[PDB]
Structure 1
Amino acid sequence: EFIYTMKKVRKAHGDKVILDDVTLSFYPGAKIGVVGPNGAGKSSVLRIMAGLDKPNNGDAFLATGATVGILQQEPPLNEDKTVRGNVEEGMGDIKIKLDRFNEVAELMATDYTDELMEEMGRLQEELDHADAWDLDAQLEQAMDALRCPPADEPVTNLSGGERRRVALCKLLLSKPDLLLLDEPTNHLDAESVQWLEQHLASYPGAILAVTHDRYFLDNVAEWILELDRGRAYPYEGNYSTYLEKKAERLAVQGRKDAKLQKRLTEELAWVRSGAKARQAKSKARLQRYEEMAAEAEKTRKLDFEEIQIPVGPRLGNVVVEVDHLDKGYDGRALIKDLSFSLPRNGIVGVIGPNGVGKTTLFKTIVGLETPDSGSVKVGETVKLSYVDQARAGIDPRKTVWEVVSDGLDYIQVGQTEVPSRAYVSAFGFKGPDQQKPAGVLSGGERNRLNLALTLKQGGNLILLDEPTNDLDVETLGSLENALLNFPGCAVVISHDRWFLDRTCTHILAWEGDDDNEAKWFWFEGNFGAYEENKVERLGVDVTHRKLTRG
């Protein structure tokens, strides 16, 4: 009747609570959307529902025979293959018991003959449970819909941000009855989300997403679950209905607490100054100050320090010269015949779907690559700063402070001697929260940590690669209003189309079709011009794939 249900659930440290009194319940087919700020507990609720952790109070009770999947905020894999990335979970109770049916039928005669009736027929019983057991012709069904990489290559550095396309195929093949997909639209395309839109719509089974897109929240979701910092409140309706009734709620809450804060100060002097006023009653009126001042500090949350990018040396007049570069691999044809300068004091945007080669183009510039037939002039005044797409500089065992400081005391950032602990809290880690391991940090504080160890050089040429992931609108605005005030050459790879309309001066973009798949067009102007230049120069200016039989 209920797929999932919760008692008075309180997952917490006793010093710092992260969930508190989370009492709610879900139906079958309950398409849910989860919204909230960073630091609320949105991923520590989807972690209880998949059994990957246990609460410190209250029972979390899945239904009887409904299985649950999960896609965490960083997706793990195995280091074996790509078609291995459709057998580990997903088709895992059929594939592991598929070769054994072909192994039990090797025609032994001295070993056993009539014991093939209670084990080989028992394996014949479990193949009817899945209603299909050829498993081969219906596994290119699962990779010609995600547009997966070719299935015969391992997930080494060979895979970029289509690592997520594989982890959206281990999960969406198990078909769980409770589907906990936590931010599926990281690193995807202008059409990879557009595939996932039509797939999560007609989907028998419950869905909990912690997404930020607007097609899921306005048309697929039916319940919206706000996560306040520790609290949890359900609501009913799509996201257009949610924000209207959210607006009138924070209206009458905005002057609920104004006259509350006015009351505490009006009887602050009543309890501090002039304690001559009443004898032997004062221990009954003083407690009503404390009982409203201890609940005035459970919503006093307005301490949000700004993201600030430090400034180092004077940037000259030449930054990146690309001398007719070609780049590729054996048989592969990425970047071909590209020449562009890089404008001093200008945000540069990169446009392209997954699999064109955006993040290798920065690896040339720092030095992690070498061009095949071409050259890149660095210019003796720039200073690189490379934040990577895969966030590979995070060592998930040692604490936060040891990742960015390397155990030192002062680190060299802005041609000064900054005390390296003060450089940590500049990106939002106040004091005793240096001492917690980085592998368990939030999606905001793993993106407010990758900016720490990569902007540690004060460089006047910073190469932002997916900066708009897993961070809310209070920091996203505090980023884009902090890399406008930066004196030179921020270069950004992004997929948020409503981010490059804010902060762009130049666009490098892919425009390849069936004559050559490795063109790169350069543009002088913002994103609100390239979307109009494209329709007046080219002609390119759907038909959904099912992922299963039905």
Structure 2
Amino acid sequence: AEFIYTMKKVRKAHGDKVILDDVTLSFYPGAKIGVVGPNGAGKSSVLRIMAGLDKPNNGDAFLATGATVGILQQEPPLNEDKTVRGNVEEGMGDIKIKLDRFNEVAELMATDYTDELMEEMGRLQEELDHADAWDLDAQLEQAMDALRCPPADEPVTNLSGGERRRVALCKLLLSKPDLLLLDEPTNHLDAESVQWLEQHLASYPGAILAVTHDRYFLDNVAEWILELDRGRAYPYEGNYSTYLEKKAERLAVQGRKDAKLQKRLTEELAWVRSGAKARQAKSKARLQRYEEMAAEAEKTRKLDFEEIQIPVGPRLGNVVVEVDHLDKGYDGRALIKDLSFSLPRNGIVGVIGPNGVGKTTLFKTIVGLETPDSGSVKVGETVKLSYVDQARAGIDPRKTVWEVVSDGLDYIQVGQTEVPSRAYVSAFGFKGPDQQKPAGVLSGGERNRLNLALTLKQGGNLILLDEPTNDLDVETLGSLENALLNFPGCAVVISHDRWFLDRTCTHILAWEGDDDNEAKWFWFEGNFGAYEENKVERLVTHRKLTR
């Protein structure tokens, strides 16, 4: 069994925060590895070593011969051409210009000399039979109907958040590399597309590495589980219910070993201050053991966790949002048609729908950044909102994380109260000298965490959150949903995490469109578990993508 990727004595560290230290492991074809770990462990930095983007400090992390590699970054890039032209840049990347050379020589060789160009239309034709590119048009027309892509002739600027991930999954799954590097593939996707990607990654010739924070995508695609602790990597097999056992066990034995090391210090620190008696001397061997036990008691300080704390706004009145017969559409396609609801006070409203159906356009009519076609939105004089788009200003990639929350100022207003800015970003995890990290080097778990710092400093009593459960681990995801239950205003949450809307929701707004209407919604007074029961009282073959 010849491998695909190997690492030998690899050590990568960003100064004090080590990512690897003397790791050595091999990736053989047919592996289905799901890599886990908390935020700051280094999961996206390992996959950029394996993609050839980054390089380790020392050690030899190389690749097998042949064996091309495709990576999905955690924020995937796109071009500025069409959707049909967005898929040909990967998977059909090098093979379209062989097709764009063979049709060139179909008229250039006729009007020119036919002896050197005879073989130039020959060795192209030898690269169209083993790769089978004679029907390259309909190979694109299949790989768009598998991921259910948006149509061919539209720009990639006015797309969804999940439609920009459906078009980026189609780039890598056409290349068919011998080593996938999926960095959070199930972000922004609905339940239909994640169920698709489970059955596609089952039958797949090649190694699959996939860093995920959820627990149900991993148990269907991964049988081996790799972990990233503070530097070390701990490979074993399981199904992520045994990951949370073994992670909580390493900290159990470490807690009552650092505690036993602590009582050895206080019995020894009492010796070094005891003062030397008559002419016998205090032993320099025991002074040297104390000065080396004090150093190993300082490279173990790991407890630093602050709860997410949402600021309370002013007192909220009886009318929060009123919507009377709302219509919204960008073309002849209609998204919202005859919608009437009224947002409650002191609840959580979950918004349900598949990709490209108008959940984010629904928020932009409430904040006023869009305009209703017919019908009105009414807010009410006590309501102060809190909302920031993902696209209109967002973050700036070379301002530091302290001057994005602040604007270079010392103290900030989080709503009729004065708090320091460095005491505010440190309440959101960014502590110590990590407050000078610019926005480009922030990871996905601390770009979602930065985005909560910008929205919640507006001090509102109606917070609108568009997918807060995006790149957060289970320690702080439970800390966020704790703070949405101690919140005395109305919170509206768009999500696709089915086991996050089942936990903290009191009202459900869901798309129940079918073939004749395609644009109707539904308001439900109750939680998500009771909406599934009420759904069945009112009221598939896997698409292949290749051949």
Q: TM-score range by the shorter chain?
A: over 0.9
**Structure 2 CA distance, aligned partners of 1:201 and 1:9?**
30
Report the Cα distance in structure 2 between the residues aligned to 1:180 and 1:393, rounded to whole angstroms.
Answer: 27
Structure 2 residue 16 is the aligned partner of structure 1 residue 18: no
Q: Deviations over 1:406-425 (max 9, x none)?
A: 22333332212333232222
Shift of 1:290: 3.6
Q: Aligned pair in 2 of structure 1 residues 370, 24: CA closer, same or farther (>3 Å)?
A: same
Q: How has the CA–CA distance of structure 1 residues 304 and 326 changed in structure 2, closer, same or farther, with 3 Å as cutoff?
A: same
Q: Distance in 2 between matches of 1:163 and 1:450?
A: 20
The structural deviation recorded for 1:382 is: 1.1
Shift in CA distance, 381/278, structure 1 to aligned 2, threshold 3 Å:
farther
2:161 aligned partner:
160
Are the counterparts in 2 of residues 197 and 215 from structure 1 also a CA contact under 8 Å?
no
Q: Report the alpha carbon displacement of residue 245 of structure 1 after superposing the two structures with TM.
A: 5.2
1:409–1:5 distance in 2 versus 1, CA, 3 Å: same
Contact 2:161 2:188 in 1 (8 A): no
Q: 1:421 maps to which residue?
A: 422
Distance 2:508 2:201 in 1: 32
CA contact (8 A) 1:387 1:465 kept: no
Partner of 2:175: 174
The structural deviation recorded for 1:446 is 0.5
Kindly state the Cα deviation for residue 112 of structure 1 after the two structures are TM-superposed.
Answer: 2.2
Are residues 511 and 288 of structure 1, via their aligned partners in 2, closer, same or farther at CA, if it must alter by over 3 Å? Answer: same
Contact kept? 2:349, 2:491, Cα under 8 Å: yes
Q: C-alpha displacement at 1:110, in angstroms?
A: 4.8
In the TM superposition, residue 403 of structure 1 has moved relative to its aligned partner by: 1.8
Tell me, in whole angstroms, the C-alpha distance in 2 between the residues paired with 1:419 and 1:374. Answer: 43
| Inter-partner Cα distance in structure 2 for 1:108 and 1:347 | 69
Displacement of 1:58 in angstroms is 1.2
> Which residue of structure 1 aligns with residue 341 of structure 2?
340
TM-score, scaled to structure 1: 0.94
In structure 2, the gaps of 5 or more residues are: none
For residues 252 and 424 of structure 1, do their structure 2 counterparts lie closer, same or farther at Cα, with a shift above 3 Å needed?
A: closer
Once the two structures are TM-superposed, the CA of residue 142 in structure 1 deviates from its matched residue by: 0.3
Change (3 A) 1:123 1:457: same
Deviation at 1:89? Answer: 1.6
Residues 1:41 and 1:391: Cα distance change in structure 2 (over 3 Å)? farther
**For 1:513 and 1:156, how far apart are their aligned partners in 2?**
27
- C-alpha separation between the residues in 1 aligned to 2:91 and 2:324? 47
* 1:388-409 per-position Cα deviation (integer Å, ceiling 9, x unaligned): 3559502222221222222233
**Following the alignment from structure 1 to structure 2, what is the Cα–Cα distance between the partners of residues 476 and 130?**
46
2:308/2:479 contact within 8 Å kept? yes
8 Å CA contact 1:312, 1:458 repeated in 2: yes
Distance 1:286 1:30, change over 3 A: farther
Q: Secondary structure at the match of 2:180?
A: strand
Closer/same/farther in 2, CA of residues 266 and 387 from structure 1, 3 Å limit: farther
Task: Find the aligned partners of 1:528 and 1:267 in 2 and give their Cα distance.
Answer: 58
Q: Which range moves more in the overlay, 47-56 or 133-142? A: 133-142
CA distance in 1 between counterparts of 2:487 and 2:137 reads: 54
Shift of 1:431: 3.0
Whether the 8 Å contact between 1:397 and 1:437 is mirrored in structure 2 is: yes
Identity percentage over the alignment? 100
SS at match of 1:481: helix
Tell me if structure 2 keeps the 8 A contact 1:223–1:235.
yes
Judging changes above 3 Å, is the alpha-carbon distance between structure 1 residues 170 and 129 closer, same or farther for their aligned structure 2 residues? same
Distance change in 2, residues 1:216/1:452 (3 Å)? closer
Matched, 1:501 2:512: no
* Greater CA drift, 370-379 or 130-139: 130-139
CA-CA distance at 1:490 after TM superposition:
0.9
Change in 2 beyond 3 A, CA 1:526/1:277: farther
Shift of 1:84: 1.5
Report which stretch shifted further, 122-131 or 491-500. Answer: 122-131
Output the CA distance in 2 between the equivalents of 1:47 and 1:440.
13
Change (3 A) 1:342 1:271: same
From the superposition, tell whether residues 208 and 314 of structure 1 become closer, same or farther in structure 2 (CA, over 3 Å): same
Quickly say closer, same or farther: Cα 1:135–1:449, change in 2 above 3 A. same
Which deviates more, 242-251 or 453-462?
Answer: 242-251
8 Å contact from structure 1 (residues 391, 450) kept in 2: no
Q: What is the rounded CA distance, in whole Å, between the counterparts of 1:159 and 1:434 in structure 2? A: 31
Q: 15-24 or 475-484: which moved more?
A: 15-24
Partner of 1:110: 111
CA apart distance, 1:331: 1.3
**Are residues 126 and 474 of structure 1, via their aligned partners in 2, closer, same or farther at CA, if it must alter by over 3 Å?**
same
Deviation digits for residues 188-236 of structure 1 (CA, Å, limit 9, x no counterpart):
1111100001001111100001113444433442321110022212113
Return 5+ residue gaps in structure 1 as ranges: none
Q: 1:82 to 1:266 in 2, by over 3 A?
A: same
- C-alpha distance in 1 between matches for 2:294 and 2:224: 34
* Cα separation, 1, equivalents of 2:20 and 2:462: 41
Per the TM alignment, residue 291 of structure 1 is displaced from its structure 2 partner at its CA by 3.0
Greater CA drift, 204-213 or 256-265: 256-265
Match of 1:208, SS?
Answer: strand
**TM, length-normalised to structure 2:** 0.95
Residues 344 and 247 (structure 1 numbering): CA distance in 2 closer, same or farther, change over 3 Å? closer
Which secondary structure state, in structure 2, belongs to the residue aligned with residue 249 of structure 1? helix
How far apart, in 2, do the equivalents of 1:64 and 1:218 lie?
31
Cα root mean square deviation, aligned: 2.0
Report SS of the residue matched to 1:451: helix
